[PDB]
Write a protein that binds this ligand. Structure first.
Ligand SMILES: [Zn+2]
Ligand SMILES: [Zn+2]
Ligand SMILES: [Zn+2]
Length: 178
């Protein structure tokens, strides 16, 4: 197995996947690495299994259909993996914890949002449809773009949104378009 966490790329107290060479810190994995279970399969492996069991799940889908899906166990897992893919980028540090807003010439957002809040919300089963999760994730980057206006720091919102969107299209097998 790898000797660094797949998500944060640091060593430490790592839990190893039994079906692939990835390793994780306990709270870097989503959901947090389970107490017992031997063997243990990581989220990458669990998603791969869904795909292998139903190869047709990879045919293209309309975003609007994906968003209306109820958060059954497979959709819950897919959103957890999508969230984890965002944390895998180092620029996610900017969006992880609760923000505050005091910049001359801007006003903070009406509805602040951050990754760890989405993480808690998924853990607590607060989202009933995929749309709930996706709306909160997109709000993170939208709030950032609006607040930072012309400061070049706005680009960090663009960059991490692009990671989110590419992974959303992959995980939920959104029909490819130009
Ligand atoms: Zn880690
Ligand atoms: Zn694995
Ligand atoms: Zn099938």
């Amino acid at each position: 197995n790898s000797n660094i966490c797949e998500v944060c790329n640091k060593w430490g107290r790592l839990f190893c996947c039994d079906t692939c060479p990835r390793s994780f810190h306990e709270h870097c994995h989503i959901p947090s690495v389970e107490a017992n279970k031997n063997p243990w399969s990581c989220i990458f492996c669990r998603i791969k299994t869904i795909q292998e069991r139903c190869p047709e799940s990879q045919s293209g889908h309309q975003e609007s259909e994906v968003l209306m899906r109820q958060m059954l166990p497979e959709e819950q897992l897919k959103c957890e993996f999508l969230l984890l893919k965002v944390y895998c980028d180092s620029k996610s540090c900017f969006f992880a914890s609760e923000p505050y807003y005091n910049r001359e010439g801007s006003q903070g957002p009406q509805k602040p949002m951050w990754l760890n809040k989405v993480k808690t919300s998924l853990n607590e089963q607060m989202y009933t449809r995929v749309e709930g999760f996706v709306q909160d994730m997109r709000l993170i980057f939208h709030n950032h773009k609006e607040f930072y206006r012309e400061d070049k720091f706005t680009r960090l919102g663009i960059q991490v949104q692009d990671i989110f969107e590419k992974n959303f299209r992959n995980i939920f097998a959104i029909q490819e378009t130009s």
